[PDB]
Amino acid sequence: PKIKTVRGAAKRFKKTGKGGFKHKHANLRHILTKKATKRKRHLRPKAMVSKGDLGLVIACLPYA
Amino acid sequence: ARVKRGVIARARHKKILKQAKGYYGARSRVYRVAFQAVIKAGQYAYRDRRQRKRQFRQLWIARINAAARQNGISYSKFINGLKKASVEIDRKILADIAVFDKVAFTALVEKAKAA
Amino acid sequence: ELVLKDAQSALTVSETTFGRDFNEALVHQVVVAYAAGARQGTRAQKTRAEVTGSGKKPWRQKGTGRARSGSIKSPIWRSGGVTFAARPQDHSQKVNKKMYRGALKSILSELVRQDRLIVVEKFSVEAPKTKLLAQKLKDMALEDVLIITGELDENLFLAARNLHKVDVRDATGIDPVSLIAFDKVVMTADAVKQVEEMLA
Amino acid sequence: MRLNTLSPAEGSKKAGKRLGRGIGSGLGKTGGRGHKGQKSRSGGGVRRGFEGGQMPLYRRLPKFGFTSRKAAITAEIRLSDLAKVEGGVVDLNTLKAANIIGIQIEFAKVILAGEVTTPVTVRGLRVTKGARAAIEAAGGKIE
RNA sequence: UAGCGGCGAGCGAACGGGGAGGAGCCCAGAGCCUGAAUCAGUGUGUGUGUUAGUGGAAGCGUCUGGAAAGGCGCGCGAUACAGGGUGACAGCCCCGUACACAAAAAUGCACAUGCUGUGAGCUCGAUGAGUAGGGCGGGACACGUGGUAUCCUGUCUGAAUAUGGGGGGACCAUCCUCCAAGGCUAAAUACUCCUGACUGACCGAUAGUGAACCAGUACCGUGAGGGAAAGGCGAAAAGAACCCCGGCGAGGGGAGUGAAAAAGAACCUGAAACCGUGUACGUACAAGCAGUGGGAGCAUGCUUAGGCGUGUGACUGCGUACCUUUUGUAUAAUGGGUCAGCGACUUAUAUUCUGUAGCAAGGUUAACCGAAUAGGGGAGCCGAAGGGAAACCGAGUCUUAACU
Numbered sequence: 001p002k003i004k005t006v007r008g009a010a011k012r013f014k015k016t017g018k019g020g021f022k023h024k025h026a027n028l029r030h031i032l033t034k035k036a037t038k039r040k041r042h043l044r045p046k047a048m049v050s051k052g053d054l055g056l057v058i059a060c061l062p063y064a
Numbered sequence: 065a066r067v068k069r070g071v072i073a074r075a076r077h078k079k080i081l082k083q084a085k086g087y088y089g090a091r092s093r094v095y096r097v098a099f100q101a102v103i104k105a106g107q108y109a110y111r112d113r114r115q116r117k118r119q120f121r122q123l124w125i126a127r128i129n130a131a132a133r134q135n136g137i138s139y140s141k142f143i144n145g146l147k148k149a150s151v152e153i154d155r156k157i158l159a160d161i162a163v164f165d166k167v168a169f170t171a172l173v174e175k176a177k178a179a
Numbered sequence: 180e181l182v183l184k185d186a187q188s189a190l191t192v193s194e195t196t197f198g199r200d201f202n203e204a205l206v207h208q209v210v211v212a213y214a215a216g217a218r219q220g221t222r223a224q225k226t227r228a229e230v231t232g233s234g235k236k237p238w239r240q241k242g243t244g245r246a247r248s249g250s251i252k253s254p255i256w257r258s259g260g261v262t263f264a265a266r267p268q269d270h271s272q273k274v275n276k277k278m279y280r281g282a283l284k285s286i287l288s289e290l291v292r293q294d295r296l297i298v299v300e301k302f303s304v305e306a307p308k309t310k311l312l313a314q315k316l317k318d319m320a321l322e323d324v325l326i327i328t329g330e331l332d333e334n335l336f337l338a339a340r341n342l343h344k345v346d347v348r349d350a351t352g353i354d355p356v357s358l359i360a361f362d363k364v365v366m367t368a369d370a371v372k373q374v375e376e377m378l379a
Numbered sequence: 380m381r382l383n384t385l386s387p388a389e390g391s392k393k394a395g396k397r398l399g400r401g402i403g404s405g406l407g408k409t410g411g412r413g414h415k416g417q418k419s420r421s422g423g424g425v426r427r428g429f430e431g432g433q434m435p436l437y438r439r440l441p442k443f444g445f446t447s448r449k450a451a452i453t454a455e456i457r458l459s460d461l462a463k464v465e466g467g468v469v470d471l472n473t474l475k476a477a478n479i480i481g482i483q484i485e486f487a488k489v490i491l492a493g494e495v496t497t498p499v500t501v502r503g504l505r506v507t508k509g510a511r512a513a514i515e516a517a518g519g520k521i522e
Numbered sequence: 523u524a525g526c527g528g529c530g531a532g533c534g535a536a537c538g539g540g541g542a543g544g545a546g547c548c549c550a551g552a553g554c555c556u557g558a559a560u561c562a563g564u565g566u567g568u569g570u571g572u573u574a575g576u577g578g579a580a581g582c583g584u585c586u587g588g589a590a591a592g593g594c595g596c597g598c599g600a601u602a603c604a605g606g607g608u609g610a611c612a613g614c615c616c617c618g619u620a621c622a623c624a625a626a627a628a629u630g631c632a633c634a635u636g637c638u639g640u641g642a643g644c645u646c647g648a649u650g651a652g653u654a655g656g657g658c659g660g661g662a663c664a665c666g667u668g669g670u671a672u673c674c675u676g677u678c679u680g681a682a683u684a685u686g687g688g689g690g691g692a693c694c695a696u697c698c699u700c701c702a703a704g705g706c707u708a709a710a711u712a713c714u715c716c717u718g719a720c721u722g723a724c725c726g727a728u729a730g731u732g733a734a735c736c737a738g739u740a741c742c743g744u745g746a747g748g749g750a751a752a753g754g755c756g757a758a759a760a761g762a763a764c765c766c767c768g769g770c771g772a773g774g775g776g777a778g779u780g781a782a783a784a785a786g787a788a789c790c791u792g793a794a795a796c797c798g799u800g801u802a803c804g805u806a807c808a809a810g811c812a813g814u815g816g817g818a819g820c821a822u823g824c825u826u827a828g829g830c831g832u833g834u835g836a837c838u839g840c841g842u843a844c845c846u847u848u849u850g851u852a853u854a855a856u857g858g859g860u861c862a863g864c865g866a867c868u869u870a871u872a873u874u875c876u877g878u879a880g881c882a883a884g885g886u887u888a889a890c891c892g893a894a895u896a897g898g899g900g901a902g903c904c905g906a907a908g909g910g911a912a913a914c915c916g917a918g919u920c921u922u923a924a925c926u
């Protein structure tokens with residue numbers, strides 16, 4: 001049979017042109033008044049997945 | 065394709081049992097025991113090729129040290145005396161001369177005396 | 180061009196079909212694949228599930244001074260198991276159109292070098308009889324052959340069943356293994372024209 | 380070439396790792412899977428994205444976005460594969476027959492992928508700024 | 523994939539497309555006119571097919587051997603060199619095989635068509651109420667009540683009835699589309715207890731069915747149920763008449779058969795463990811993984827008028843088995859009485875990476891038609907373009923009011 005995509009991972013990552021994955025940052029859902037604006041600004045944009053945990057993403061979704 | 069393996073195994077066992085030919089008890093006639101003895105024999109064989117060279121040197125040196133003290137010189141002085149007179153002759157031959165040609169050997173000790 | 184043995188006519192056949200470098204790997208792969216396609220692969224042993232018997236423990240786990248056993252059917256036991264029992268499987272393997280054509284082009288070109296390819300004009304026995312076909316090959320100086328024809332004559336077909344070393348196949352139905360296997364290849368002028376168009 | 384004389388290309392085949400066949404094989408006894416542990420066992424190893432009970436990366440990061448439905452029924456046509464239809468008329472049904480875009484694609488767009496030669500009148504189709512410069516420089520008038 | 527999902531584990535569509543196969547009708551009823559389409563039988567026609575079958579080609583001589591099909595040398599049939607048998611491997615010795623013919627009788631088919639028996643086609647009328655829908659509780663839909671359409675309903679209710687209603691995924695309105703609440707319908711599709719024929723990069727007696735053999739037997743169990751072991755003399759029984767020892771025995775030894783009887787029925791081959799008989803050397807003052815390097819003697823072979831090989835191994839330096847598990851094992855930690863046989867990284871489909879072969883901005887087909895490993899069939903897939911949550915823009919675009 002075909003491989004089943006880890007759906008949870010499909011909705012949190014997205015494959016860029018080179019091969020790596022973009023993801024949204026943590027710590028930007030609730031408890032924000034105590035957080036400084038500089039944090040909340042830096043956490044707003046999408047960010048690339050690190051080298052260490054790339055293989056864990058690549059396995060979770062083999063069809064990109 | 066099924067591979068019945070009765071022909072190959074027997075030839076493997078029979079090859080090793082032939083190497084164990086001579087040993088006492090089960091060692092000669094029982095593969096499972098033989099195989100250990102045959103390996104150990106190899107282990108000891110690899111070792112004693114190194115010891116052959118050590119033992120024979122000791123054996124020669126003993127003969128030279130025996131034959132020198134007949135003529136009144138200790139082995140330690142004899143060899144130093146030969147090396148000061150720059151004689152390249154080894155222990156193997158010195159020991160063989162010391163046994164066979166005594167009249168010859170005497171001249172080597174008389175040469176070692178000079179230095 | 181390709182000369183004949185009873186005319187000496189210049190059949191101008193294409194360059195890249197009958198005159199290309201012999202690629203060994205491609206041919207090997209295609210003939211191996213053709214062999215692999217011939218297999219039916221109908222065979223089955225029975226796994227420890229499929230063996231007849233009970234799932235009862237022959238003796239209890241502990242207490243008895245014996246090696247813990249779970250069933251009679253386990254492959255370490257006698258009379259049942261075969262750990263990795265094979266099932267009826269399809270051994271046929273895919274070959275690419277361009278690779279199959281490339282391989283035919285490759286082998287069929289090498290027959291021109293080795294002179295196994297004996298191209299001819301009309302080749303057909305008088306009546307459906309083996310005795311005539313057997314006698315007429317002695318004049319042609321042949322024995323083990325693949326007589327490829329465009330217009331497949333029943334006369335010629337029936338006359339070559341019982342002959343072992345002769346095989347009559349239609350120009351449409353040429354194979355990689357056959358062109359390699361047989362010692363000479365007798366092609367009809369129409370068959371060359373058909374195969375030329377087929378392989379292209 | 381005879382049926383025996385054939386051989387594969389050097390580098391084609393590579394045997395295969397046969398585990399559990401003596402010391403001389405290299406791998407053999409614990410066939411390349413070490414001593415003990417979950418990974419060594421038959422049916423061993425953990426599932427995908429399992430970091431030993433720690434919250435996995437695909438759960439500790441927030442999900443985002445939504446899958447667009449309009450994005451499924453739109454194509455990105457190359458400027459290279461433009462003049463491959465019917466002289467120089469590329470609406471949608473014409474382009475669809477040429478097998479450049481799928482059947483269920485209503486909207487579509489022509490982008491600057493390079494190279495035009497013939498004059499092609501691109502009707503009933505969205506077209507890019509750089510493509511509009513090229514297609515008109517070739518000859519064909521858009522819309 | 524879209525979705526569903528302690529949005530975890532996991533589950534997983536439809537639209538649209540390519541194929542195989544194609545076929546539609548009856549009722550909730552009134553006119554003239556009526557056996558004419560239709561089938562459902564009794565049938566009638568060939569063609570059969572099937573359950574018995576018939577014919578069916580052409581080789582000899584030497585050599586080896588127990589025996590010829592073998593070798594060697596010359597023939598001949600072949601729409602028959604599939605295959606099995608025959609004293610070793612047979613185109614031509616036999617049974618078959620290809621090919622041409624068959625059925626008194628029973629039957630399973632496909633068309634004429636006499637027909638107890640059935641209604642044409644055709645205007646009109648009809649169009650399925652405790653129903654659809656709703657509340658409550660469950661279930662089925664990929665869809666876990668979720669914003670949940672759709673269908674099935676246990677329960678309580680309740681329309682319009684074709685200016686009517688259903689649906690188009692909360693819902694509403696416009697458009698489009700269908701017509702529920704009654705029925706019957708072949709083919710493509712699934713299966714093989716069973717009957718043939720044929721084929722295996724299937725097994726060859728610890729395998730293959732549990733079962734090659736009087737096996738679902740012996741035996742075990744109150745019973746449900748479990749469940750074995752056990753193949754081969756030889757070409758042909760020519761299976762050893764007859765003597766001898768012994769208990770008018772078992773068992774042997776001669777004779778005789780046969781190519782052979784260590785092929786004599788406990789019967790092809792006959793390994794190992796294990797147990798003997800005889801020959802050579804060593805062995806009753808000598809300590810230990812029993813070997814290993816050194817090495818006298820003694821016993822045997824060869825050719826030479828001197829040296830080697832083989833067996834043995836007095837004496838002597840070194841030397842604590844193997845596996846496992848371990849920081850670490852001679853360990854007094856694990857496992858093995860020994861031998862023989864069997865016994866463990868596989869198979870299928872998806873996926874990424876390495877090598878290799880093809881073709882190259884292209885590559886490539888899937889099912890399927892195919893007498894078929896060709897050739898069609900590019901439905902699709904993947905690539906050549908990305909950014910963005912998305913509309914959207916695109917060699918740029920996102921971010922932002924805007925970007926040096």
Ligand SMILES: [Mg+2]
Nearest residue numbers: 028029030032
């Ligand atoms: Mg938020």
Ligand SMILES: [Mg+2]
Nearest residue numbers: 034035036037
């Ligand atoms: Mg602050």
Ligand SMILES: [Mg+2]
Nearest residue numbers: 050051052053
């Ligand atoms: Mg790293």
Ligand SMILES: [Mg+2]
Nearest residue numbers: 063064523903
């Ligand atoms: Mg995909």
Ligand SMILES: [Mg+2]
Nearest residue numbers: 068070071072
């Ligand atoms: Mg063999």
Ligand SMILES: [Mg+2]
Nearest residue numbers: 074077078794
């Ligand atoms: Mg043995």
Ligand SMILES: [Mg+2]
Nearest residue numbers: 075076078079
């Ligand atoms: Mg060997």
Ligand SMILES: [Mg+2]
Nearest residue numbers: 085086092093
């Ligand atoms: Mg021995």
Ligand SMILES: [Mg+2]
Nearest residue numbers: 085086087835
């Ligand atoms: Mg000895």
Ligand SMILES: [Mg+2]
Nearest residue numbers: 081085092093
């Ligand atoms: Mg022996």
Ligand SMILES: [Mg+2]
Nearest residue numbers: 117118119121
């Ligand atoms: Mg030394």
Ligand SMILES: [Mg+2]
Nearest residue numbers: 114117118121
């Ligand atoms: Mg040294």
Ligand SMILES: [Mg+2]
Nearest residue numbers: 202203204879
């Ligand atoms: Mg090449």
Ligand SMILES: [Mg+2]
Nearest residue numbers: 233234235236
């Ligand atoms: Mg059970």
Ligand SMILES: [Mg+2]
Nearest residue numbers: 233234235236
């Ligand atoms: Mg139970």
Ligand SMILES: [Mg+2]
Nearest residue numbers: 243244245246
């Ligand atoms: Mg015990």
